[model samples]
Target: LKRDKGLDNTLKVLKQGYLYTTNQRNRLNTSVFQTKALGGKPFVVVTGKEGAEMFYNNDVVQREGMLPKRIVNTLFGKGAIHTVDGKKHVDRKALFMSLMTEGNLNYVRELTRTLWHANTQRMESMDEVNIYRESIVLLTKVGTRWAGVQAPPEDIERIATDMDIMIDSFRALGGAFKGYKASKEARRRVEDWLEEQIIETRKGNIHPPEGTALYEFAHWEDYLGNPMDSRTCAIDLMNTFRPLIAINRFVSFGLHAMNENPITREKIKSEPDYAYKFAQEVRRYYPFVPFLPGKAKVDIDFQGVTIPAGVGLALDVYGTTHDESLWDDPNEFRPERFETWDGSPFDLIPQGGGDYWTNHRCAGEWITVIIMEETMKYFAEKITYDVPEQDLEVDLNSIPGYVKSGFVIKNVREVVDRT
Candidate 1:
């Protein structure tokens, strides 16, 4: 098997299987050689702790900037913050790291709790709510608050709406190229709105305001003497916040699992300590981003196959999480896996390997895990809901469908008393 053309063949196989459902196509490796055809092509499945280390450490898996440019620029403008490489990426990432620390984690938690409470109050008039839609708003609000930007209610609503339209267009584009035109239009609207907000916030001298991500970025001085601007700062906030929405999709899946599997729900409701463990299990068992693609930076030899520079490589994040060799009953949702194991941190990576130094890795993952833990616990302990058996069959792999539509709550019981 030749490395240069192997990825193309692998993608052909995947496309035939219709495995690229939703945004999962981005998660698969471009090449795979079946055991039967080993001599014909060099195919390797990246899995387990050692696999993760070798895959990430290979240096060839560097991010290809051009691939995500359209989406990033449409969603977050084409700024140096999102486009630059090397030291610039490191410095910007470091600035974000400084702001997102243990000391400030509680602050973000309080804000999320407050936002969730306030957002849920609005749900009182309705019996069922699309969590995906609602979460985008919640995360956007929290993101702006974290960035120190006072987003207008109307602008926030527009941003959310535009994003949804763009997403829909992307979905439609899968079927026909006409959707690309719609996507372009939607992108223009979103970009214009983001630019407007950036300009307004900058001109208003709102850089150092309290309780916003912009405030933190405004104060972060790069060694080059160029303080981060509002536009770049806004892009950084969007990058952080957008994934919060993406993660919520999985959170909804976890909730669905709890609803259908009463035993798991009961376990979580009864035992508070299991919250984090259970959330980790949920992340591992389910498919989020299946693979992350990268372009090879230089020639590399692995398992007798040589991959030359500029070739595409996809890391199977879901595959690693569910590898049967590493995990017992990989399909089962067991929080005890982490509790019972004494091994490398690579054994279970819900948010990719803890290679924080890597460019593609998530920086706000700890914050996300904490939020999920608290939010899931709140739902389990405080909310008593019954999900219908029929709705349990709703496909989670499809978009534009309600995950929490058929669930009914008997009552809202407060498990913990703040007073």
Candidate 2:
């Protein structure tokens, strides 16, 4: 490891945005380099698969109290599972893992496919629609209905819109706090709603379906077999909502994959497994989570780099996924790259890697894949639409970016004959 040549801090993190670590690593030509963030606290930015594996090891790093306060309120909500580690993390994580069973994965898949089918019917009638907005609506409904959110039907769209705001605008707002403030407000409103649901569920006023996340979470137990408070329970369920809403970004990029890489679209339409391959590629290629932040749990040494306990460790997610060492022609949008994908938990960590059952790796990863593949196949086979002239540009400067103009399309219509 080498020290950062300059006084790097969160200010630099904001200025450089998603490319901060990648650009620095390229210039320094090192996988691990120490710097400073949040004023003078020493930290290191790490990249590549080795770095990922190290970052995830609890003995090397931990997430307890590692997140920014703004991110806590805006992105994770208060009391979310992101704040736990060790046995507590494993026990708490089971609530999410329980919902990721094969049965539930298929449930979300079939539900999302049906919504996409119905959504395409409206898209067919319209001259144009924003695929990004359309997906938020469709997946939001699917995710909430699956979670057994007892909120009124009409409020669903409003809730979904707020979740989208949380993802799109949670980044630093150029010192204006406009976007961050909006995220804060949106999360606050949702927290209140989920709090009510948790309370009502406890009071027997609401009966969510068995095996559903809402039901499971409403009765979730702590380490001592005690039921958590409504506030904590609400945050747990919001984790489910947050990831589902954020999937729209991948949906946008998946649509971008089809339009930009024509070969993939044809394969997705004609081949089932290939579409999943394409979904993995989308996760690999696009920028969503910029990086993961954790803290050194002890005096840890990995790959000859020693990080003092409590030192902030930045896991360079974007850089690792795009590392030339991992992928041939790393810049290319080829789905077939996954054909021989070594199946390393350290690689392709768009949603974090490692075992989802115990680690911080997202439990909803399968859900993201299933929804993506199902929708990808549907778009390829069940509908045809015109990609009108628009700014198909993706601004990598934004953390968790999007296609410009929300992936506009024109003259969409369903294919009558599906053999």
Candidate 3:
């Protein structure tokens, strides 16, 4: 149980208020905020309600620059979305924000139902299935369909294949040390696939179907005052949908957490309004993005330590959610914490709170809540499953291998009451 030297030093400095580090462990405990790492150097954790406000107010905590350059390049790929500053960012976010508004929520709901129904029907005869993998395919189909990117089955398959390769290579490289060759190859494949889709869609002169993000981007003028061609529009659509690729991970984690915790599962089943509370706790308990990295925009003084410009700052989202000062039982999952509170709490930000519109603050959060709520309700009311050895085993840290072996009713027909 020996702490790593880096973590030990980081913990010490952070506690002293001479520096600020947002590692998960440091955030989970309150003492870390007022302690020092090397020699009475204070560390500050800007989290909870107050922290979220400060973060959102400060322009320096930029997401695009917070992440590694290679990753950003890999995501945008010659797009202006990454290079734009304040006003442009606001305008661009406003245009895309419409897709996630209340009016469009029904669209996403219908889309989710359609995909789930179709996939469930396909799995009717199979004894076992991977919901995680199924969710990715379903979401991808929904995204492409929304964008109105009509392609042969082979073309879609190729894009899916390239995406898989890129994801695997990314994991292998680790965020800090991905190799040049792997990244270059993955980027080339993805770019080629995107370009092919763009060219084909253009040659076909296929406009996005009505009420889709693709339709809007393709037909409407962009915030940058540029009329996007079919190719450019298609690329923009891809960027918008790329984030959805991570939604499956969130879904899986939510389900896995409920299945493992009986008290939480029972609470969700007995009370539906509490679903929102449950979902909030789940986000805090098993955050999909454990660590958020940012670089200093300028040299700044906090307490007594100086953080030079260009130094990387890692925010431990997982730790922040579990901090004791902001939560009654930080380590335990309790949806009631949110039930009693309203608005942002520095420690309770599952979605980054500051500058919600500008800072990659999960535009689809409301939709995510709806999807999780519906899914959890459906499972609680219609399905029966149990996690074996629940007390003896816990995977509070690692997300990739968290799901347990459980039996979900394969057919809705079996559970439906016709009387």
Q: Which prediction has the highest lDDT against the true structure?
A: 2
Whole-model lDDT for model 2 versus the true structure?
0.82
User: Which of the two, 1 or 2, has more lDDT?
Assistant: 2
Candidate 3 lDDT score at position 232: 52
Tens-digit lDDT track for model 1 on 1-419? Answer: 32223423434433322233212223433334221111233233444576566556635566546334444434445573445556777777777676676657887688878877665556545565555566666766766566555667877766665555554432221233455565667666654555565566557644445534555554556769786665665556556555554555556666776766668767777877787787777777765444444555777675556666655555556666777778999877777787876745576665667456546456777777777777677677665544434444434333323354533343243454788
| Cα lDDT listed for each candidate | 0.57, 0.82, 0.54
**What's model 3's overall lDDT?**
0.54
Q: What is the Å distance of residue 10 in model 2 from its true position?
A: 2.8
Q: TM-score, each model?
A: 0.77, 0.95, 0.74
- TM-score for predicted model 1 compared with the true structure: 0.77
For model 3, give the 10-residue run with minimal summed lDDT.
11-20
* Residue 104 accuracy (lDDT) in model 3: 72
Candidate 2 deviates by what RMSD?
1.9
Ranking by TM-score: 2, 1, 3
Q: What C-alpha lDDT, on a 0 to 100 scale, does residue 147 get in candidate 1?
A: 51
